């Protein structure tokens, strides 16, 4: 369209006093090909609105044209394009040449201080290119060369940082696909959780990237035995950002399946295209053991008695007594519980560890507890003044 | 001209980060501070010039009143060029800055460069102009390309503080014609009748 010769012309006339980079012949090739609204390459404010939706693939020649930007502005958004924008095109072959041309603090560092790499929009590539080289070898070569470049990124982020979150976006982006191929789903959920915190403010806030990110949380939160099971899903608005159809339905039905505890629901909820992984085969029985164990704690609790028994645990989880002293013992060793189980006298003494976040029922109950404590101290305090 | 205190405000917003001046105007605005500093410093041997950047970084105090440009230039390179220009909270904190001077008999003057239209409401500027008028606060407004893509939001602020040129309420507009940086303020009543230009 004419937005190249209209928006960019007004901003180059009233604002820009001189136009070294504005030429009619250079911008003529832009309108000659794509006549629609979305363009390929641009400058001034127009280039920020453009995205990869049209897949221009012209940014290789756009980087060579940055030499003309030096007479206009410094180097800011040059890092946002090229190596940072090639992730949508998914080309690991020709992208290797631009990795060795820039590197860190060679062509990007002359008169300008550190903008903190390629985090968002403006910046000069320092730690971003080194992070993408590890990502380049992540989807092509093994993970040995990828982790070697991530060691200097973790030490630098913890050393030099700022109040907001910028570098963490590019830092957790490589770790998002790094732990996906691994067998650890507990650290994979913690990585995608902090990466989602930076997705809402900026960096492709459209629902296209939100539905793709939810596929990582749905697998990690289900297999993750660390923090509850579904507890973290109801707090943060995760499921609220996606739809209920196109294989997203099994995430919403997981709430009622874990709450009720019916074993027959898990068979029809997870088909053979998912449960075929050996990870879930071991975690198939780990979902109902943790929820029913924490449920019996609040049920038997009256005042000082948290004590349980074997019949309460065996009838709840439908498990034999041989697994009562085993599966529950594994959760105790992970820091979920303190007290142990007595096999001789048939008594189960469990202490209190889990803070039980998001309750709301005990708030009205603990209100009278503070009044009872305040009355006993005040009653004994008045006797201290008399005698 | 006479002994007075000048508070300078730099504009850093999305328009300053985009294409503005071929020299990277954010670096040229640093030279724009040097242009008015050398003019006011050569006028009187003792002068107080402050620096406050309230655009996109939230209201802050960088450097206090000083007669040297050494600490003024070094603090501008560590600022941020992103954000939005807010003149509502920038002008209110500048009134208390005027009390930082030694002798209270000095003339209170505020010189602010506005290169982008503000998104803040104009209701706070009405009660602010009436307060600055009682204390005789010289208002210097430099608008660069603001009257083209948007109307004047500071016009209501100038209308309430409106006074003859012998006291305060000086409204200026940058000429759209291309010219040198230090020449834009030369014809305007800013560095006129000073030590240098």
Swiss-Prot record, chain A:
Disulfide bonds: none annotated. Signal peptide: none annotated. SMART domains: PINT. GO terms for cellular component: cytosol; nucleus; proteasome complex; proteasome regulatory particle, lid subcomplex; proteasome storage granule. InterPro entries: PCI_dom, PSD13_N, PSMD13, Rpn9_C, WH_DNA-bd_sf. Residues 187-355 form the PCI domain. Keywords: Proteasome. Pfam families: PCI, PSD13_N, Rpn9_C. One of its GO terms (biological process) is proteasome assembly. GO terms for molecular function: structural molecule activity. Present with 12400 molecules/cell in log phase SD medium. Belongs to the proteasome subunit S11 family. Acts as a regulatory subunit of the 26S proteasome which is involved in the ATP-dependent degradation of ubiquitinated proteins. This is 26S proteasome regulatory subunit RPN9. It comes from Saccharomyces cerevisiae (strain ATCC 204508 / S288c) (Baker's yeast).
Swiss-Prot record, chain B:
Multiubiquitin binding protein. The 26S proteasome is composed of a core protease, known as the 20S proteasome, capped at one or both ends by the 19S regulatory complex (RC). The RC is composed of at least 18 different subunits in two subcomplexes, the base and the lid, which form the portions proximal and distal to the 20S proteolytic core, respectively. Ubiquitinated, leading to its degradation. Ubiquitination is promoted by HUL5. The keyword Nucleus does not apply. Keywords: Proteasome, Ubl conjugation. This is 26S proteasome regulatory subunit RPN10. GO terms for biological process: proteasome assembly; proteasome-mediated ubiquitin-dependent protein catabolic process; ubiquitin-dependent protein catabolic process. The keyword Signal does not apply. Residues 5-190 form the VWFA domain. It comes from Saccharomyces cerevisiae (strain ATCC 204508 / S288c). Belongs to the proteasome subunit S5A family. Present with 17200 molecules/cell in log phase SD medium. GO terms for cellular component: cytosol; nucleus; proteasome complex; proteasome regulatory particle, base subcomplex. The lineage of its organism: Eukaryota, Fungi, Dikarya, Ascomycota, Saccharomycotina. Disruption phenotype: Cells are viable. GO terms for molecular function: K48-linked polyubiquitin modification-dependent protein binding; polyubiquitin modification-dependent protein binding.
């Amino acid at each position: 369209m004419f937005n190249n010769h209209e928006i960019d012309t007004i901003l180059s006339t009233l604002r820009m006093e001189a136009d070294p980079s504005l030429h009619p012949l250079f911008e003529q090739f832009e309108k000659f090909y794509e006549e629609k609204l979305w363009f390929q390459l641009s400058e001034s404010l127009t280039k920020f609105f453009d995205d990869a939706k049209s897949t221009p693939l012209r940014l290789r020649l756009y980087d060579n044209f940055v030499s003309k930007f030096y007479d206009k502005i410094n180097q800011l958004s040059v890092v946002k394009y090229l190596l940072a924008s090639l992730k949508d095109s998914k080309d690991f072959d020709e992208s290797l040449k631009y990795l060795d041309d820039l590197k860190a603090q060679f062509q990007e560092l002359d008169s300008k201080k550190q903008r903190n790499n390629g985090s968002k929009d403006h910046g000069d590539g320092i730690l971003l290119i080194d992070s993408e080289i590890a990502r380049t070898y992540l989807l092509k070569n093994d993970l040995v060369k990828a982790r070697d470049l991530l060691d200097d990124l973790e030490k630098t982020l913890d050393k030099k940082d700022s109040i907001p979150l910028r570098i963490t976006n590019s830092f957790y982006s490589t770790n998002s696909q790094y732990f996906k191929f691994k067998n650890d789903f507990n650290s994979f959920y913690y990585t995608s959780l902090l990466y989602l915190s930076t997705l809402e403010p900026s960096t492709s806030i459209t629902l296209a990237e939100r539905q793709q990110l939810a596929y990582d949380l749905s697998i990690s939160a289900l297999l993750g035995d660390k923090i509850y099971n579904f507890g973290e899903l109801l707090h943060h608005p995760i499921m609220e950002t996606i739809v209920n159809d196109s294989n997203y339905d099994w995430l919403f039905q997981l709430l009622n399946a874990l709450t009720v505890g019916d074993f027959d629901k898990f068979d029809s909820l997870i088909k053979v295209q998912i449960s075929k992984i050996p990870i879930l085969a071991q975690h198939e029985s780990f979902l109902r053991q943790k929820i029913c164990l924490m449920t019996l704690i609040e049920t038997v609790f009256v005042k000082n008695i948290r004590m349980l028994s074997f019949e309460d645990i065996s009838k709840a989880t439908h498990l034999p007594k041989d697994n009562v002293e085993h599966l529950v013992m594994r959760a105790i060793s992970l820091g979920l519980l303190k007290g142990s189980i007595d096999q001789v006298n048939e008594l189960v003494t469990i202490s209190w560890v889990q803070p039980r976040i998001i309750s709301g029922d005990q708030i009205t109950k603990m209100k009278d507890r503070l009044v009872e404590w305040n009355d006993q101290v005040e009653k004994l305090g008045k006797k201290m003044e008399a005698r | 001209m006479v002994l007075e205190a000048t508070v300078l405000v730099i504009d850093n917003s999305e328009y300053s980060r985009n294409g503005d001046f071929p020299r990277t105007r954010f670096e040229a605005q640093i030279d724009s501070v040097e242009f008015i500093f050398q003019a006011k410093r050569n006028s009187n041997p003792e002068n107080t010039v402050g620096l406050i950047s309230g655009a996109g970084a939230n209201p802050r105090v960088l450097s206090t009143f000083t007669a040297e440009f050494g600490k003024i230039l070094a603090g501008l390179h560590d600022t941020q060029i992103e954000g939005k220009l807010h003149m509502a909270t920038a002008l209110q904190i500048a009134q208390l800055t005027l009390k930082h001077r030694q002798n209270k008999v000095q003339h209170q003057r505020i010189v602010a460069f506005v290169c982008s239209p503000i998104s803040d409401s104009r209701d706070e500027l009405i009660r602010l102009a009436k307060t600055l008028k009682k204390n005789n606060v010289a208002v210097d407004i430099i608008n660069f390309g603001e009257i083209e893509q948007n109307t004047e939001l500071l016009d209501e602020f100038i209308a309430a503080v409106n006074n003859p040129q012998e006291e305060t309420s000086h409204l200026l507009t940058v000429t759209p014609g291309p010219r040198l940086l230090y020449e834009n303020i030369a014809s305007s009543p800013i560095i006129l009748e000073e030590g240098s230009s």
